[PDB]
Amino acid sequence: GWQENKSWNAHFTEHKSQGVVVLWNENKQQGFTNNLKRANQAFLPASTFKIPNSLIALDLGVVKDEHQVFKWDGQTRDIATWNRDHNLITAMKYSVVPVYQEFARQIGEARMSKMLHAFDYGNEDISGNVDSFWLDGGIRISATEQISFLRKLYHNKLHVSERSQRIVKQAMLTEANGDYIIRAKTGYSTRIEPKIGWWVGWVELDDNVWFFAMNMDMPTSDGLGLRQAITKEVLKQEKIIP
Amino acid sequence: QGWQENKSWNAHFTEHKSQGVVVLWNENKQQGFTNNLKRANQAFLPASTFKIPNSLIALDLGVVKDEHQVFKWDGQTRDIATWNRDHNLITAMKYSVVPVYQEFARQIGEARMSKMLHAFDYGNEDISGNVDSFWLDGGIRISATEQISFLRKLYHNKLHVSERSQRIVKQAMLTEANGDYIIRAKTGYSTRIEPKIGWWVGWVELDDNVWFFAMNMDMPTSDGLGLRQAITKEVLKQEKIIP
Ligand SMILES: *[B@@]1([O])OC2=C([C]=[C]C(F)=C2C([O])=O)[C]2[C][C]21
């Protein structure tokens, strides 16, 4: 089904890394990946889980809108940007775990489980703490499963309101120029080996949309920038972005 | 809610032998800034900045079902090549595709167009002329400061049209985004009556504030259209709004 393009391995090998990029051409309904096996390997979603978590929190009114302020709890954490008040936009932008842990507690494990089943999300397993299972519990999702979920969100087909989906897609906005719009979410899974980085999302063109999902070995935080860099190299190689 | 006149911004205009006005509005502080209070309050044809209210009305009335609905090219080849193809709301805004918005306006009709603009408090609310061309050569006029007042309502979902229509139009206004800011805006270019001018109106979203802007400048030929964004960006950089 998917076409394998092993030449993209060159972009990982340049940085003494390994990983997978998965692309989906929405118009043609064709998929491409450098590694058919790793494309289907399920990992902790880590902070890419902020996408379904945001959708669920909005649909249940835990988050009223993208302006609602979630005040800092006063606990100083290692990521300076977390130590301040946030709304949905900035909590996504800075991947603010304590804000989303409060969402998850308010959602509760019964509703969290039902929504992930409704979303057909990964292995639909929330075993672990209700406020950390996407970092060190049972939930597992592959890059191709991320594409599936993102396609539903793009088409407003997920089992939540249209408004919720529109707001989350606004919150995913990452980059836009006159050539393309990227809506995406990064993730860095460090609590359980193997430590991996994620980038999942899509590229909007005038006449098409390319969905992507990538993950890569990430032993130290020094390489986090390679998630976007390698993905963009693949997008350029494939003539999706100039 | 006061105003400061900062005439040092004029250096960005005179560098290009241009003249114009930039108006900024700091939402958090409710403070306005401009290089020219007189011109900030002079009203002009909106030209294609009218695509913002026009999109809202078309969406709210169901003339546009959503941002994917295709509006077909009428087969008349026009000067701007990107016009000569099918469009949706996103690409029609991006390329300022007048023929698509003229079809919107004809479907909206005079009475509904007039009612909506009054309820929006949009400029002088005057649609005199052809319903599908009054923003190019009819009676509608709007000042840069009046553009801000309208845009602030849109940002806050305070217009009387649906929240959905307001969200879709703000998505369609997306012009630039990065790790430092988001710009939602619409360009305009008006030549059918004097003075010929370029517009750029919209806002800059920061982590913790929103800066609304509305600029216009003399545009004696189309050669200077790019100065609309470049001069605005120079002012935003001078004021430390963007890096
Ligand atoms: B999560 O996966 O998001 C995250 C963390 C640390 C560093 C990062 F770059 C990212 C990210 O990808 O946004 C921790 C909090 C979680």
Ligand SMILES: *[B@@]1([O])OC2=C([C]=[C]C(F)=C2C([O])=O)[C]2[C][C]21
């Ligand atoms: B409108 O004012 O928009 C427009 C036109 C021509 C060239 C442009 F750059 C622009 C603009 O400002 O987007 C014509 C169609 C109208």
Ligand SMILES: [Cl-]
């Ligand atoms: Cl957006």
Ligand SMILES: [Mg+2]
């Ligand atoms: Mg390289």
Ligand SMILES: [Mg+2]
């Ligand atoms: Mg299932």
Ligand SMILES: [Mg+2]
């Ligand atoms: Mg200059």
Ligand SMILES: [Mg+2]
């Ligand atoms: Mg009025």
